[PDB]
Design a protein around this ligand. Structure first.
Ligand SMILES: CN1C(=O)N[C@@]2(OO)C(=O)NC(=O)N=C12
Ligand SMILES: CN1C(=O)N[C@@]2(OO)C(=O)NC(=O)N=C12
Ligand SMILES: CN1C(=O)N[C@@]2(OO)C(=O)NC(=O)N=C12
Ligand SMILES: CN1C(=O)N[C@@]2(OO)C(=O)NC(=O)N=C12
Lengths: 295, 295, 295, 295
C-alpha cells in the first residue's frame, strides 16, 4: 500500500467580521464559512502514526480567525489568497492550501429611505463563493462563483424539435415556465502569487456584479430555445466583459412545473392557452451543465 | 378505547398560479404550499374499517387545485377561508377544516430600472403564512404570520442587570451583536363566515406589510435592553395600528455571536472595544416568546 | 397592551454523557438535545426593561450540564422531571418549566458476535423524545414519544370503499404499498411530583419498548383497510398494556408510491398484477392523525 | 467562445422495485435515487439552438424506469453499467454516460424472531452508492461507496505529538472521544464492457460487505493515534482483500466533543479523568482525506 493523495484541514469555520467607520459611525458586517485543506509531506501521519508533521486542524481554525483579524476579508478572492499563502510559506513541508469560502448575505436595512448605519437583513440565501488553490511553485488558481440564485419566468421559454424515438413521451411546447437555481463559476488566469492577486483586487467585486447582472438580464430577456441555448449566451457575454477569465461553468437544474388537466371536473379548461394552475415538481429535475472557454 | 380527537388530510400540496393582464401583457405569479386537515363524523374509519366516511386525501388535493383555478389565491386569508368553507359546506359530516398556507416569494425582476413583465426572483426564504380554522357553527379563525425574516444588528444591543447566582457565568454587556429569525403571528377577530372575511380583504395585505415594517424599524432603531423588551415594542405597535387584531405572538431565537480572545497570540486585542472577529454559534440558542393582547 | 403569555429559555442544547462500569470496563453513552422554556412572574422583562427577573438562558444552559453531571440522564422522563423541578423550586418567581428532550441513538457495536465495550453506531435517525411540563401546584405532565421510525410494506395494504363524488379520481385498490414515518406519543397520568415519577422509573423504558414493538408488529401483520384502521389498532393495544397511560396520539404520513404505466413502450405491462417499478412521490403526502383514550 | 465541456441529463430520479418469489411468497424491495448525465456531439444545442441532438431529460427518465423493469437493479454496479451502456449504444452521437445511484436501506423486519415476508424498516440513513462512467472506446469505470455511516467510540482514541507553534492552543490528549461519518470509496479496475462487469457480479456485494466490516472492526479495535493512522489501516485491509480494487478513498469528519469545565460551580470535577458530561460541537469540524493505492 502507498498514499496516492492526502489532504486534511478544518471545514465549516463560521467567521463574522465588523468594520467601524469612525467618521460616519457606519458599520459594515461580513459573514462567511471557511474550509482550509492542506497537502504536503504528511504521508507519515497516515502510515507511521507520525503526528509531528500535522499542523492541527484546531491550529488551522485559530489561523483563520487571526488572519481575518489582521487582514481585509473582502474581496473573498484576496482573503483566500492571503490565507492559503500563509500555510505554504509558514510551513516548509506544506506544499498546497485549498481554501473554500462561502459568503453569506447581510444587506444593509433601508429605514424610511435611509440606509441604516448598523442594521442588516439576510435578504437572500444566494451565496458568493471562492475556491482558492495555492500550490507551491505553480501560483494561485481562483474560481469565483455565485450559487443559490433562484429565478422563474412564466413565459418566453420553449422546448421543441428535440429527438423523438420509442423512449419519448414529452410533447413539444412553444410556451412553458422556466425555473432554475443558478450556479455559475468563472475561473481566473493563474496568478503568480499574492502581489499579482492584489494588483487586480477591484476586478473581483466588479466581475461578480457583471456575472450576476448578465445572468439575470439574459434569463429575463432571452426567448429561450432551451436551457442549453440560454446558459451559453450568459457565458459568452461574461467572457466578452473580462479578459482575465479563462472559463465560465454554469450548472442549471430544470425545475419542472407541470400542467394539471382538470377537464374531468365539469370540463374545466386548465391546459395549453388556458393553463393557470400548475403543479411544481420537487423531483426529478433536469440538470444542464456547460463550460465555455475562448478560441 | 374511544377516539378523543381525529383529523386527516393532504399536506405539502405545492401550487403555482399565474395571472395574465391582457391589456399590459404583465404576468404575476403566486406559489404556495397547502395543507388541509378535516375533522368530523369520521371515527368509524378508525374503529370499524368504514372508508365510506373518508373524503380521500387524493380528492382533497384535487379540490385544492380546482379551488385555486376558480378563485383568487390572494390574499391567502381569503383563499384559505374559501377552501375551508368548501369542505364544511360540501360534506354534511365534515365539521371543521384546518387550512395552512405557506406563501413563497416570487419578486418581479428589475432589468435596467424597468420591472420585467414575466421574470421573477426568489429574493428571500422569508415566508408569509396563514392558518385558517373553519369550524361549523363557530365561524372562521385566521392567524396570519411572517417567518424566516433573518436580521442582524452590530451594536445598540445590551444585556445587563439580569439575575446572578451560583449558576451564572455570563458577563453583563453594554454592546453586543443581536441576530434573530423573526416569527410573528397576528390573530384576527373571529369572522362569522365568508362574507365577513371578504368585507375585510384589503386589510390582510395592509396588515402584513405593517407588521413587517414595524418589525424591521423597531429592530433597527431600538437601543435594545433585551430581546424581551424589543419584541414587546413591536407587538404593541402592531396592535395599535389594526383594531381587528386580538393578539400578536413573537418567537425569536437569540443567535449568539461570541467574542474570540486572541491575546494568547502576540497580545492581539479582539475583545470588548477591540472586538472585530466573532464566532457565530450554531447552537445552542436562546428562544424568547411573547403573546401580547389588549386590556 | 398586556402580556397574555410568555415563555423563554435555551433551545438546541446538545448533551453527551458517558457511564464507565469499573468492574467490566464497559462504557455506555447517552446523547440528547435539550430545550428548557420557563414561565412565571417575568412580564416586566418585556414591559419595563426589567432584566432582574430573567434567569439568563446562558445560566439555563449551565444548569442543564450541571444537572446531567449530578443525576442519571436515563430514563429521559426522569431527567426531564429533575431538570424541570429544579427551576420551579430554585426560583420563587418561576412557576412552570417546559423541558423537551430528543434522545439520539448510539447503539453498541457487535464485533465478531461480541458487544464492544466502548464503540457505538448511529444505527437509525429514529428518536425517542419526552415533553415534561412541570407546573407549580399542578404536578408533572409527561408525554413520551418515538418519531422518525420509517417503515414500508409491499402488499397487504388496501384502500377501497371511500367516498366517490365529482372531486374523486382515485381508483379503489385491493393491493398497494404502504410507507410511513411513525410519530407516536403516549401521555402519562399526571404525577404529583418527583417522588411519584421516581416510583415508576422502570415503566418508562418498558412502555417505550412496548409501544415500538406493538407499532412494528401491528404494521407488519395488519392486512390494512386504511392508515386510520391500522393506527387505531396500534393505539388500542398500547393502552391495554399500560394502565398509567391516559392517551396515545399517532401522526402518520401516507408516503405514496405511484404505479408507472409503461404500455406506451412495446406494450410493457407494469400496472396492477404486473406492477414491479414504482415512482415514490416526495410530495404531496396524506397525513392521518388519531388520539385514542379510555371509556 | 467555444464549449470546452458539456453534460446534461436527469437528476433525482426516485426508483422503487419489488421482487416477488412465487414459491415462498417472500417479497424483496429496492429503492434508489438515480442521476444520468450524457456527453457527446451536443455542442450545437448550446451554440445554435439545435434541439435535434438532445435526448430529452424526460426521455432519460423514462429510460431509467424501462431499464429497471427489464433488468435486475442489484448489484447497483451492474444496473448502472447496463443503464450507461444503453445510452452510448442506442445513440450514435452520445459518447459517455455518467450514472450515479444512491441505494436507500429497506431492511426486512424481524417479528418474534421470524423475518417478515413483505415488511421493511429504514434501519439507517447510511447509503450504498455507485458512480458508473461508461465512455465509448475506454470501457466502464466503477466507483463503489458507502456513506453516512456514523460511529462513535468513547475511549481508545489519542492525539498527541502534533506540531506546536505560536498558532497552537490545542492540549495533547491520551484519551478522547472519536466520532465520524464514514465516506469510503473503492475504485475498480477498468472493465472493457458489460460482459466483464457481469463476469464479476458476485464481487460487488461481497466487497461492499468487506469494506463495511473492515471499517467497523478497525474503528472499534484500533487504539487510535489519529484519524489519519486509523483510516489508513482500514484502506490497507480492504486493498489486501480484493485484487480487482485499484484505490480506496476515505473522507472522515472529526466531530469534536468538548470537555466542560464545571469547577466554577461548587468545585465540580468534570475534566480529564473525571470528564462525564461533554458538549458535542456542531461546527467547525476536522476533515481528514486519504487515497490509498498499491505499489
Ligand atoms: C423539458 N426538458 C427535457 O426533457 N430536457 C431538458 O432538460 O430538462 C433539456 O434538455 N432542455 C430543456 O430546456 N428542457 C428540457
Ligand atoms: C444573553 N442572553 C441570555 O443568556 N438570555 C437571553 O436569551 O438568549 C435573554 O433572556 N435576553 C437576551 O436578550 N439575551 C439573552
Ligand atoms: C390513498 N389515500 C387517500 O387518498 N386518502 C388516504 O390518505 O392518504 C386515507 O384517508 N387513507 C388511506 O389509507 N389511504 C389514503
Ligand atoms: C484534534 N484534531 C486536530 O486539531 N486535528 C485533527 O483533525 O481534527 C487531526 O489532524 N487528527 C486528529 O485525529 N485529531 C485532530
Amino acid at each position: 500500500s502507498a498514499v496516492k493523495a492526502a489532504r486534511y484541514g478544518k471545514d465549516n469555520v463560521r467567521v463574522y467580521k465588523v468594520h467601524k467607520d469612525e467618521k460616519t459611525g457606519v458599520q459594515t458586517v461580513y459573514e462567511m464559512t471557511v474550509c482550509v485543506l492542506l497537502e504536503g509531506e504528511i504521508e507519515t501521519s497516515y502510515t507511521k502514526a507520525d503526528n509531528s508533521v500535522i499542523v492541527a486542524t484546531d491550529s488551522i481554525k485559530n489561523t483563520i480567525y487571526i488572519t481575518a483579524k489582521q487582514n481585509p476579508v473582502t474581496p473573498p478572492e484576496l482573503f483566500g489568497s492571503i490565507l492559503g499563502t500563509h500555510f505554504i510559506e509558514k510551513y516548509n513541508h506544506i506544499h498546497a492550501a485549498h481554501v473554500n469560502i462561502v459568503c453569506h448575505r447581510w444587506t444593509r436595512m433601508d429605514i424610511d429611505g435611509k440606509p441604516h448605519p448598523h442594521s442588516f437583513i439576510r435578504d437572500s440565501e444566494e451565496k458568493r463563493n471562492v475556491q482558492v488553490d495555492v500550490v507551491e511553485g505553480k501560483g494561485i488558481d481562483i474560481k469565483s462563483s455565485l450559487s443559490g440564485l433562484t429565478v422563474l419566468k412564466s413565459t418566453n421559454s420553449q422546448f421543441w424539435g428535440f429527438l423523438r424515438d420509442e423512449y419519448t413521451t414529452l410533447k413539444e411546447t412553444w410556451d412553458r415556465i422556466l425555473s432554475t437555481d443558478v450556479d455559475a463559476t468563472w475561473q481566473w488566469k493563474n496568478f503568480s502569487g499574492l502581489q499579482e492577486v492584489r494588483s487586480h483586487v477591484p476586478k473581483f467585486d466588479a466581475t461578480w456584479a457583471t456575472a450576476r447582472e448578465v445572468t439575470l438580464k439574459t434569463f429575463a430577456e432571452d426567448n429561450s430555445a432551451s436551457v442549453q441555448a440560454t446558459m451559453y449566451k450568459m457565458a459568452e457575454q461574461i467572457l466578452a466583459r473580462q479578459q482575465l477569465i479563462e472559463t465560465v461553468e454554469y450548472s442549471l437544474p430544470n425545475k419542472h412545473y407541470f400542467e394539471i388537466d382538470l377537464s374531468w371536473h365539469k370540463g374545466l379548461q386548465n391546459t395549453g392557452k388556458n393553463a393557470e394552475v400548475f403543479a411544481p415538481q420537487s423531483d426529478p429535475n433536469g440538470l444542464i451543465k456547460c463550460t465555455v472557454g475562448r478560441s
